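Dear Dr. L.,

I hope this message finds you well. Following up on our conversation about the binding site, I have prepared a predicted three-dimensional model of the protein together with PLG. For your records, I am including the exact sequence and ligand specification that went into the calculation, followed by the structure tokens. Please feel free to forward this to your student if that is useful.
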Amino acid sequence: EKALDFRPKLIICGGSAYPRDWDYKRFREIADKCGALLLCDMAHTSGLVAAQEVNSPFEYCDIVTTTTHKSLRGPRAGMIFYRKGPKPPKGQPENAVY
Amino acid sequence: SNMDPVSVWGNTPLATVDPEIHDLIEKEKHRQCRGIELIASENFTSFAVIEALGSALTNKYSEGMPGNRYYGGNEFIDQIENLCRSRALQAFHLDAQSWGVNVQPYSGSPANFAAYTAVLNPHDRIMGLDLPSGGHLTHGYYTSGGKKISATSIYFESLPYKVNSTTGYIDYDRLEEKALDFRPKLIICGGSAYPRDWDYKRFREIADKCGALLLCDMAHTSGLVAAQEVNSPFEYCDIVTTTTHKSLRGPRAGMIFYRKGPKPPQPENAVYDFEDKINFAVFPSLQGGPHNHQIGALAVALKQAASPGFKAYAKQVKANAVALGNYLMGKGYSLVTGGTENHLVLWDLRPLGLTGNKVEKLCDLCNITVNKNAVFGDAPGGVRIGAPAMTSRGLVEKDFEQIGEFLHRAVTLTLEIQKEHGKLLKDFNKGLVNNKAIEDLKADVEKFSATFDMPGFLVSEMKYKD
Amino acid sequence: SNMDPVSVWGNTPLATVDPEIHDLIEKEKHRQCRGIELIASENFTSFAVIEALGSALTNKYSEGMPGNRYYGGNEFIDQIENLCRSRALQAFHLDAQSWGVNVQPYSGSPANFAAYTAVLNPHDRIMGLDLPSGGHLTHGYYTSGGKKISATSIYFESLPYKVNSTTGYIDYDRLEEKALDFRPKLIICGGSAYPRDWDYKRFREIADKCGALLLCDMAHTSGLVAAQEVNSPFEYCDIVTTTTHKSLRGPRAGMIFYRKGPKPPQPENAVYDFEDKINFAVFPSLQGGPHNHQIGALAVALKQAASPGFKAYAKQVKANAVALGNYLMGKGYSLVTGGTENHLVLWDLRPLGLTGNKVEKLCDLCNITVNKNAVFGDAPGGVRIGAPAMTSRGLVEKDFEQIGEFLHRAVTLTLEIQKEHGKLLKDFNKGLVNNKAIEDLKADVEKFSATFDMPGFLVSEMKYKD
Amino acid sequence: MDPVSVWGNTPLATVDPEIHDLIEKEKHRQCRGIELIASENFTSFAVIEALGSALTNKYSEGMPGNRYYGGNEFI
Ligand SMILES: Cc1ncc(COP(=O)(O)O)c(CNCC(=O)O)c1O
Ligand SMILES: Cc1ncc(COP(=O)(O)O)c(CNCC(=O)O)c1O
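The resulting structure of the complex is given below.
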């Protein structure tokens, strides 16, 4: 409801103190309905994501950002993952690419 | 090789200088007294207003405020503007120690945008009534696709609030919740197709809780406000904007009212700082020279609005809208909120399976002018209908019931044409060509309208009398 | 308890409805024909324009474009607007396949701001002529202290360009250098106190080199442009805005011209995309309903401007400005650029040790209306003087030399009063009370002005004939 | 759901033309004939207005002051 009212260009999912997994499919559904990009900040659960122990944001998000020093157990740094190549089928022109 | 003499180019009447524009105006004068004018933002103003509007006042440049002008020749312009300002305050029963007014806005949309410029920075947050809920373009409008339509939404960050989906009244609780989330610097109240009064007290409570300025755009009901026939926004709002041509029955112009003096209990004995910001926003920020013929005509309209006849006019407008609304409901038509507390009715046509487009088109052909209008959760689904213009021609309740019957016939015809030719506009249009029933209704409308008086010009002197 | 009858409130003349505003207008009509009106942005328009301005056209709401309106009743409004648009194109000798025009702007400042809204995003960069170099507020203005005054500088990022400090002409080379540094999306040309013609060809070269749109605001000289008496901005500019009340001699209104069709050699057969953006910026982005009485009056003014008499008027305006300028220089007065190529002269008073404030004040008291005006490297140091208004009353070169002599007497008096009472305004004012010489000059001015004809009303019918 | 006014505030003549017609015919029978039934009378319009009124919407079991539930201030 707030997304359809506010019309964000970008919806962020992921958090710092949320003890449950995320329904990225529903986030994708909401983002598609309102016309937004969808970004996951998986900083906290990046290690669990890499180990395939929580839902993967990559299946539904356009961009995935993370730190490297929390559950990923690396140095202090950041990474930005982004989709490349042809866009999946969507009022979208054929041959559309990321 | 020589200039035309002043008498040839400058003193000759319009009928001779420009027969083609003179003819077109006479045709428009005839259209105005031979149809039923139900556009809720229209009115028929007085001859005295039109005489001041069309006067030498158009020749004078006078940038600035009276007493603080950028150049001279303003001895009389200053008195006319000072008179307009003082009559504005009197017509709305305002103490000059508590309220000031700027009467230079060219129209209502410039008035609103100058108010925003005065008290907001670019990209500051604003909320106003959503357009499908009865709000106005200048209160903010962007599409589902994110296209920013209103300049309000281009230069500020707007978020609409809506009516309650069950009742059609403002949803005050959802507005409070949204204002606390969004944190607007400015909340706008008033609208263009809302048929109920406003709880300005509750708007002030929401604005105080979230830290917002509160502005009312009373353009549509300004005449009812001046006559004290609806709630007064001045009791609770920091700023009040308005047009002057709708229910106020004046020229096309705008005004900005603003509070002065002590603020309610912030530092002690803190005072409002609107006056200088608002005057400066109008000039030199946004406008150039005032349109002094509009200001003089507006001063006339504000004198007329302060009269006992105008108080009776405003009562009659309300009574006419109610009488028309009740007539339509009696025929099984659906009104938004099931009635009206002001000058308009909002007629939801979706229960009939009709669009606003078809009903507006069909009785435009019968000389009945309404406007298709969005309705909640909408190809507009309704039509908006106003009483101010026909009330100004002298009509009363039973005349507005006859207007109800003409509308009942028109929508009956619309249903028949849609049933026989189809719902696509291309197909629906087939039923509009050489339709005896349309011609019949148009003839009935024109005979009805011709019986009434007409302000602003003499029907006895007009070129097209047939 | 009853409404006033339509004849009482709605058909009674202004003289009876509002004697106080009627009296003030008659006094302003008298001031207009008993003084010397040298405000360069003023004119005296025709009775035919005033009759259309003051007409039933004020009653019609018509949001949208003709043929694409939001509601009905617009059969005749559409023809009047379509006629206005076509006459606008004809008066400026424009091919309709290459140029379109929007005639709804309320005034020149709304016209400019709508043009910016059409083609720029918020905070896009703009350059226009600096105010002390003769530019206009709407072209951008912020103070030394950084305060953003113009709405152009509030909502966009403006940077001024200046005249050459030696010659007073536009410094085209420094503008090119600045445009390449600042990289504006929009460069504005035209101004309000620049006394020379514009090299639009060079502006197009600078705009092409830096990638900018090019817009001319021809408000002041529009009438000279239509008469082909100055360079045409249309040869080189993407967009042309204007007011219609200054040298064009029309109502107070604005217009936006824009290119259509193929662009000059970018993709092949690429075309201009201004029309839809400009129409949409005017409505629904910024304005509400058009002021249809202004549009009809403007259509009249555009017919009059297309006449051989108007071409002769525009020549005479130029000849009158030159004759006045030459008279003043002969008395040892300093003009900016040492002359004029258009309708105004800019008189630099600093060599005399005088301010614009004193000279404007003193001959306002003698019924001579000028405006103090900033001059390069400035308490404005000069006065601006225009020929359009008095030329419209029929004056020719030797009448403008008499006007020169009245100004020579006024500035002589100003010097004497400043010498005898002092330079501080408080002290200078002491010499303005019961000054026989001022009274004498005022009497001479009034006898001079009373001999000339007056457009727009009949001096034979006015209330104050003495 | 219909809009309230469409079903709830429209007149009998259009909601139910057959019943409206039958009542109109019975009103006509009542004043074109000689009604000599000793147990019949013609009551007043004032009585009929109170009879067809919002009072029909109120349940008020029990007695004034001694009711089974609330809302009976005016009943
Ligand atoms: C060049 C120019 N452009 C636009 C405007 C604005 O016109 P409006 O007042 O209609 O908004 C002016 C007014 N200039 C007034 C003067 O120079 O005296 C102007 O000089
Ligand atoms: C509430 C409101 N505010 C401002 C305006 C703008 O007025 P101008 O056209 O003078 O700019 C309108 C116009 N509303 C037109 C209508 O509802 O039909 C309005 O309805």
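In brief: Chain B touches chain A at residues 142, 144-146, 159-160, 178, 181-182 (CB under 8 Å).

With kind regards,
A. P.
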